[PDB]
């Protein structure tokens, strides 16, 4: 068990390290065609997908790591805007599209890095989501969340919708 933990962590340190080092040079506003910047979400997905448990959801909906990224909001000011906006967006039903899109926000919003290392700081209520000896319930949870803030200075920037039929 303790070794799935450590393969995603030191993963996803190349995928910062590496995404930073790339971002350095680069010197220029990245945008959701940089094959770096998606390389790390996916490894920051697998991150949160381990140690989650069954769905609670009254209507039965397996949020997968979405629902512990919910409580991002109920901890930090600045994140109720982007967890919200993903919701009022359209074209996004399935949960784990939303974590996804949601990542990219918290990413633009530099606050990423803060998120994580709220939720790490809260196993009170990180545990209802999350095993006992989940990774973000252990050492790499802090541990990357503590790398994650050589990311604050990159300038990323997806693209979520756009409108042009009103005059």
């Not at 890095?113 to 000896?133: G, H, P, Q, R």
């Not at 990357?144 to 409108?163: Q, R, S, T």
Request: net charge neutral; hydrophobic share 45%; proline share 3%.
């Amino acid at each position: 068990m303790a070794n799935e933990r450590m393969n995603l962590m030191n993963m996803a340190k190349l995928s910062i390290k590496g995404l930073i080092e790339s971002a350095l040079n680069l010197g220029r506003t990245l945008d959701s065609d940089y094959a770096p910047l998606q390389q790390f979400f996916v490894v920051m997905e697998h991150c949160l997908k381990h140690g989650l448990k069954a769905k609670k959801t009254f209507l039965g909906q397996n949020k997968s790591f979405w629902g512990p990224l919910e409580l991002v909001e109920k901890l930090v000011p600045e994140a109720a805007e982007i967890t919200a906006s993903v919701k009022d967006l359209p074209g996004l039903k399935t949960p784990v599209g939303r974590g996804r899109a949601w990542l990219r926000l918290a990413l633009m919003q530099k606050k990423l890095s803060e998120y994580m290392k709220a939720l790490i700081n809260k196993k009170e209520l990180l545990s209802e989501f999350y095993e006992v000896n989940a990774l973000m319930m252990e050492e790499e949870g802090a541990i990357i969340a503590g790398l994650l803030v050589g990311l604050n200075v990159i300038d990323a920037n997806f693209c979520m919708k756009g409108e042009d039929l009103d005059s």
